Amino acid sequence: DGCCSKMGGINYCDSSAGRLVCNNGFYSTCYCTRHAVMDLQFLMGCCLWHGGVYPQLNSSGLVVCNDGYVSEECSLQK
């Protein structure tokens, strides 16, 4: 919760940088918009590095991506 602790508290959200400003003149470590530089390295979902999931609903459990590849990994087993 406590972003600007041992500082004066939250002044405002700077949306140009995506960061909070504390009541002394220091930038905070907390983000305040989604267009801030976050260091994302781990993403969930399947059919990444293809087009994503082709959204037809299938009688069987195969999951097919938008470029024809078939995800055997997200597919349910028998």
Interface with other proteins (CB under 8 A): 2-7, 11-17, 19, 21-31, 34, 37-42, 44-49, 71-74, 76-77
* Residue 43: CB minimum distance to other proteins, A: 8
Q: Which residue has the tokens 């590095």?
A: 49
Is residue 67 classed as helix, strand or coil in its secondary structure? coil
Phi/psi-derived region of residue 21, left when phi > 0, alpha when psi is between -120 and 50, beta in every other case: beta
Nearest to 21 by CA among 9, 6, 39: 9
Nearest residue (CB) to other proteins, 41 versus 59? 41
Provide, rounded to whole angstroms, the least separation between the CB of residue 75 and other proteins.
10
Query: How far is the C-alpha of 8 from the C-alpha of 31, rounded, in Å?
Result: 17
Closest CB to other proteins among 30 and 54? 30
* Min CB(54)–other proteins separation in Å: 15
